[PDB]
Design goal:
The protein is built from 17 helices and 24 strands. Strands 1, 3, 8, 9, 10, 11, 13, 14, 15, 16 and 17 form an eleven-stranded mixed beta sheet that branches. The chain has a six-stranded antiparallel beta sheet with strand order 2-12-4-5-6-7. A four-stranded mixed beta sheet has the order 19-23-22-21. Strand 5 and strand 6 form a beta hairpin. The protein binds sodium ion. Sodium ion binds next to helix 6 and strand 17.
C-alpha cells in the first residue's frame, strides 16, 4: 500500500484508492545532508482527478479534507488544542497544494500551508489565504526530516476511487549566511514570505503589483521531484496571510509590531526561548501595557479615564492588582501608553464591526490576518473568511523611501543622518513613484518611529467624532505646536518631538477637498458631508479648512487614506531648549520650502 510521491508523481501518477489508504515517505533528511544549514523547505504537488473527495495527512495530526466545496486544514499546535482552517473553493478542477517548513535551531516555530486553484491552462485562477500555524514541536522536526503522506478517498457519489497527482516535488532555499535572526526571518509573517521561493515570486509580483525587492543571492535547489511554477493573470487582489499564535496574544503582538516596528515573527513562538532581552526598550513595555489593560477587563471606551487617573496619581491604587500594575506601567512611559493603548483600542473597535460576537475578549486572542494591498488601487478588500481575525493592511511605509545612507533615527537632539540632500533624493523618488506632498505632521518621538518605520495606523479618537483622521498642516509652524510630548514622562521631563512630511498617492488628488468654514462648526458636519458625498467620518478623502475662524489651515486625512500615506522626516528640527516655543522661521531650510508646494484642493460650488 506504499508509493514514492517524488519518483512516480514528479511528472504524473494515478494512485488506486479502492483498497483504502496509500502512504509515501517524504525523507528530506537524506537529500538535505548533515549541514545544509538554516532555510525553507517548499513541498508542492498538483491534485487532479480524485482531488475533490480526499483526506490527506501531511504528518501526525496535520490533516487536509477536500469535499469539492471546501479545503479544510486540521493541525495539532504548541498551544491549548488543535485548530481548523476552512477555505471555500472559488473554482472547480485542478489545484496546487503548497507547504513551507522552516529548517534550523533559530528558525520560526510555524509552517505555511496554502492552496492555488488552477484553470484549463494550468494558470492560478484563485488563491487561498497563506495559513500560518504554530504546530507542535513534533510536527516542526518531522516535517523537516522524514514525514509520511497518507492518502484516503472519502465516499461521495463518484464511482471511481483514484487520485491523479502531477508536478510533485520539494525545493530548499538556504538562508543567506549573514544578518541577525530577527532580520533573516522578518518577512516570515508578511505577504513577502512568497518572495523567498523563485517558484512563487510571479504570484506575489502580479497580485500585489509590487516587486519582491528578500534574501539576495538565494538559490531554489530542487531536492526531489519536479515542482511546477504556475503563471497567473488574476486581476490585482489582496494576498491574505492568517497568523495563528500558540500563546493566544494576537492583539498584544500586532500592536507591539505596529508601535515598535518589530517584525511580527520576532513576537511569535520561539523554538529557543530567549526572553525580552533583544526587545526590552519598546517590545516588552508596549506588549506589557496591552496585556495589562486586557487583564483588567475594562472596556477600551474608558482608556482616556484610565490614563488621566494614572497620571494624576491622586486616587489610592493597590499596586498588587492588575488595575494598579496598568497604572504603574502608564506612569513608567506615558508617551507609548497613549500611542500603544489608543492603537489597540482602534484595532479592537474595527474588529468588533467585522461580524457579530467580535467582543473585546475575542479580539485579545484572535488570529492576525495580514493583507498585501495591491499597488495603484486605493481599495484593499479583505476576503470574507477573515471576519473572525484582527486585520492589518500592509502598505509601503516611509522607511522604504529614505534612500541610501546610515540608519535614520529620532532623538531630542535632532533626526540622525537626515540631510537636506537625502530629503531631496527621497522627495524626487516619491514624486516618480506617484505620490504628492499634503503637508507636515508634528508628533512625539515614539509615534514618529512607528509612522516612518512601520506606517500610519489608526488610533482611537472617539471623543472628537465625527472628525477622526490623521491631522496634517500645510504650514510647518502649525504642525510644530504638536511636535512634542503631551505631558511629563516618569523622570518629569517634556521632550521636543519631530516634524514629518506626509505624502498620499496621486490617485487621491480628486478627493482632497477644502472649505472656508471652521472644521468643528455647527453646519460644518453636514456641509462637509455633502461636499464629500457621504456623512463623516472621512474615508478615502481629506478635508482642508480653518482650525479656528481666521485661524491657520488644518488637513484631516481619512484613516483609510492615511494608512496609504508615506511619511518621511522633515529637515526642520524641533528646538530642544524651547519646548512649547514657536517655530523659528529661519530654521526652515530654503531647499525644503521649495519642495513643499501643496496641491490645488477641490472646494464646494
Ligand atoms: Na505591519
Amino acid at each position: 500500500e506504499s508509493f514514492n510521491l517524488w519518483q512516480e508523481c514528479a511528472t504524473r501518477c494515478t494512485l488506486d484508492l479502492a483498497q483504502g489508504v496509500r502512504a509515501s515517505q517524504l525523507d528530506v533528511a537524506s537529500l538535505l545532508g548533515e549541514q545544509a544549514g538554516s532555510g525553507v523547505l517548499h513541498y508542492s504537488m498538483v491534485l487532479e482527478e480524485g482531488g475533490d473527495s480526499l483526506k490527506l495527512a501531511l504528518g501526525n495530526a496535520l490533516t487536509l479534507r477536500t469535499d469539492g466545496t471546501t479545503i479544510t486544514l486540521t493541525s495539532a499546535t504548541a498551544g491549548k488544542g488543535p485548530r481548523t482552517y476552512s477555505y471555500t473553493r472559488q473554482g472547480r478542477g485542478n489545484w496546487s497544494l503548497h507547504w513551507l517548513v522552516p529548517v534550523g535551531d533559530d528558525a520560526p516555530a510555524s509552517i505555511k500551508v496554502f492552496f492555488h486553484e488552477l484553470d484549463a491552462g494550468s494558470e492560478v485562477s484563485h488563491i487561498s489565504p497563506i495559513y500560518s500555524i504554530e504546530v507542535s514541536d513534533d510536527l516542526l522536526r518531522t516535517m523537516a526530516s522524514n514525514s509520511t503522506l497518507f492518502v484516503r478517498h472519502v465516499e461521495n457519489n463518484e464511482i471511481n476511487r483514484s487520485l491523479t497527482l502531477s508536478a510533485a516535488g520539494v525545493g530548499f532555499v538556504a538562508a543567506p549566511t549573514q544578518h541577525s535572526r530577527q532580520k533573516r526571518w522578518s518577512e516570515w509573517h508578511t505577504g513577502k514570505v512568497l518572495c523567498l521561493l523563485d517558484p512563487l515570486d510571479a504570484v506575489y509580483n502580479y497580485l500585489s503589483q509590487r516587486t519582491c525587492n528578500t534574501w539576495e543571492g538565494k538559490v531554489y535547489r530542487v531536492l526531489a521531484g519536479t515542482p511546477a511554477s504556475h503563471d497567473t493573470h488574476i486581476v490585482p487582489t489582496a494576498i491574505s496571510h492568517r497568523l495563528h499564535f500558540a500563546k493566544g496574544d494576537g492583539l498584544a503582538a500586532l500592536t507591539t509590531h505596529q508601535v515598535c516596528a518589530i517584525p511580527l515573527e520576532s513576537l511569535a513562538r520561539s523554538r529557543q526561548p530567549r526572553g525580552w532581552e533583544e526587545l526590552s526598550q519598546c517590545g516588552y513595555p508596549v506588549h506589557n501595557l496591552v496585556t495589562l489593560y486586557l487583564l483588567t477587563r475594562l472596556p477600551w471606551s474608558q482608556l482616556d479615564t484610565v490614563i488621566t487617573q494614572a497620571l494624576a496619581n491622586t486616587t489610592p491604587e493597590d499596586g498588587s492588582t492588575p488595575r494598579g500594575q496598568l497604572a504603574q506601567a502608564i506612569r513608567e512611559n506615558p508617551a507609548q501608553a497613549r500611542l500603544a493603548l489608543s492603537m489597540a483600542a482602534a484595532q479592537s473597535d474595527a474588529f468588533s464591526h467585522q461580524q457579530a460576537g467580535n467582543s473585546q475578549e475575542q479580539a485579545a486572542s484572535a488570529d492576525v490576518v495580514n493583507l498585501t494591498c495591491p499597488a495603484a488601487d486605493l481599495n484593499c478588500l479583505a476576503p470574507a473568511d477573515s471576519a473572525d481575525a484582527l486585520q492589518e493592511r500592509d502598505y509601503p511605509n516611509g522607511a522604504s523611501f529614505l534612500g541610501d545612507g546610515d540608519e535614520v533615527s529620532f532623538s531630542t537632539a535632532g533626526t540622525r543622518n537626515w540631510s537636506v540632500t537625502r530629503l531631496e533624493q527621497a522627495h524626487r523618488q516619491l514624486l516618480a513613484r506617484g505620490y504628492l506632498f499634503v503637508g507636515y505632521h508634528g508628533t512625539f518621538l515614539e509615534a514618529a518611529h512607528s509612522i516612518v518605520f512601520e506606517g500610519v495606523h489608526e488610533r482611537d479618537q472617539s471623543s472628537i467624532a465625527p472628525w477622526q483622521g490623521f491631522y496634517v498642516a500645510g504650514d510647518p509652524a502649525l504642525a510644530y505646536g504638536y511636535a512634542q510630548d503631551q505631558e511629563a514622562d516618569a523622570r518629569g521631563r517634556i521632550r521636543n518631538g519631530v516634524l514629518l512630511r506626509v505624502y498620499v498617492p496621486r490617485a487621491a488628488l480628486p478627493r482632497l477637498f477644502a472649505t472656508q468654514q471652521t472644521l468643528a462648526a455647527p453646519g460644518a458636519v453636514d456641509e462637509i458631508g455633502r461636499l464629500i458625498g457621504h456623512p463623516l467620518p472621512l474615508q478615502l478623502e481629506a478635508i482642508t479648512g480653518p482650525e479656528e475662524e481666521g485661524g491657520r489651515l488644518a488637513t484631516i486625512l481619512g484613516w483609510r487614506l492615511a494608512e496609504q500615506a508615506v511619511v518621511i522626516p522633515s529637515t526642520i528640527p524641533t528646538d530642544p531648549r524651547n519646548v512649547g516655543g514657536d517655530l523659528d522661521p529661519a530654521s526652515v531650510p530654503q531647499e525644503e520650502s521649495a519642495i513643499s508646494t501643496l496641491p490645488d484642493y477641490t472646494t464646494q460650488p
